[PDB]
């Protein structure tokens, strides 16, 4: 799944930054969040987030929802590696399993239950 952030920030610079930020704010997890191609819903203000390790995916839905001012009837789905993480994982667990060699975790969101329609 293409990411703009990866496209325009060189790996080794993503890696030094991710290492620093883990070392500097350890009880939070660094997350890149970008709208899925062809998602019809709101675009996000910023894309770099430092998230409490013990926040649930579920709870993170509410926070992101509120940041893009979704309509009640709008849907929101998350995608890590083309796959939905279950609401019942922590962001910390998601980070452990799914972070990349640059120390970031990458999440795309959509109004479709499939990336990326």
């Amino acid at each position: 799944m293409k990411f703009v952030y990866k496209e325009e920030h060189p790996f080794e610079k993503r890696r030094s930054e991710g290492e620093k930020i883990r070392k500097k704010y350890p009880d939070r997890v660094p997350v890149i969040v970008e709208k899925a191609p062809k998602a019809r819903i709101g675009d996000l203000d910023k894309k770099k987030y430092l998230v409490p390790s013990d926040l649930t995916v579920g709870q993170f839905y509410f926070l992101i929802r509120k940041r893009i001012h979704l309509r009640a009837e709008d849907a929101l789905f998350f995608f890590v590696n083309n796959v939905i993480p279950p609401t019942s994982a922590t962001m910390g667990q998601l980070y452990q399993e799914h972070h990349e060699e640059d120390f970031f975790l990458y999440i795309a969101y959509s109004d479709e239950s499939v990336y990326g329609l």
């Binding site: 500097k24 910023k46 770099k48 987030y49 430092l50 409490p52 926040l55 926070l63």
Partner: peptide, 12 residues
């Protein structure tokens, strides 16, 4: 809230 280029996401 926003330091080091990251939104410090709080429980809220």
């Amino acid at each position: 809230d926003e330091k080091d280029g990251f939104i410090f996401v709080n429980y809220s």
